[PDB]
Design an enzyme around this catalytic site. Sequence first.
Site, short mmCIF file in Angstrom:
data_model
loop_
_atom_site.label_atom_id
_atom_site.label_comp_id
_atom_site.label_asym_id
_atom_site.label_seq_id
_atom_site.Cartn_x
_atom_site.Cartn_y
_atom_site.Cartn_z
N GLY A 87 0.86 -1.19 0.00
CA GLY A 87 0.00 0.00 0.00
C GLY A 87 0.89 1.24 0.00
CG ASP A 126 -4.26 -4.86 2.22
OD1 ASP A 126 -5.42 -5.25 2.42
OD2 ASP A 126 -3.99 -3.67 2.01
CD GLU A 127 2.36 -3.16 7.24
OE1 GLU A 127 2.44 -2.95 8.47
OE2 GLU A 127 3.18 -3.88 6.61
CE1 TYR A 128 4.18 -0.23 5.41
CE2 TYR A 128 3.10 1.01 7.18
CZ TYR A 128 4.12 0.17 6.73
OH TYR A 128 5.08 -0.29 7.61
#
Length: 265
Positions: A87, A126-128
């Site tokens: 992300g 799936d981070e940020y």
Amino acid sequence: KQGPTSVAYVEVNNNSMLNVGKYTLADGGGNAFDVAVIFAANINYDTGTKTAYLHFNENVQRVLDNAVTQIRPLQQQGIKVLLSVLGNHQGAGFANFPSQQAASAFAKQLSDAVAKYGLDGVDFADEYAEYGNNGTAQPNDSSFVHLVTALRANMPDKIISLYNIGPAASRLSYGGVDVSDKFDYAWNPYYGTWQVPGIALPKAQLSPAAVEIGRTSRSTVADLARRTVDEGYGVYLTYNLDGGDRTADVSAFTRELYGSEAVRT
Ligand SMILES: [Zn+2]
């Protein structure tokens, strides 16, 4: 060489992908790492067209542009290279594509990037994403299923893995389609711990263990590698392989996974 699949993530902002190829087993000469992950390209959001798109920062672009020196040599030696996608604080994430068509267009950008640069696969982190920024929606339950289905369809014989974190990692089933089986591997993102991924994949394709090479104590590195083999898990994750001499750290887990200590070129 016989034992769990070894994976190494390299933060290409500060480190060379080639470091992953430097370690082999003293007994056998096999690779200490089987997979190398370019961390990380990203999912950007065009507020104007209201469309997410694949973005490579200058560092990621530089290594892709130099695939012949930065990637190709790793592949020559039998190490698989994957492009991680993270992300980028712009609202668009793997879990909030508005439709099947939208998710599919992004999967094409991914598969196109994989073919263009001769990569072996993609890793989803799936981070940020910060779902919501720039007027975007919150994660929904079809986005990721649509994105994974399209990507896998696009590159049937390549790798797709899951960095086990975020909204996407919890949204693997929609409309009767469970996308767990389209993933080759899935792993724990928390260094120094044992956390079995929830994704419904068999033990052989999961890595509950995660270590940050050089940071996690060699005792814990050794312990998690030992538990990996004892519990029958088929993958082991090393994060942040850097340019320093980490032979002792690599040996801590290779002795357990493979029965050999490592050597560094
Ligand atoms: Zn942010």
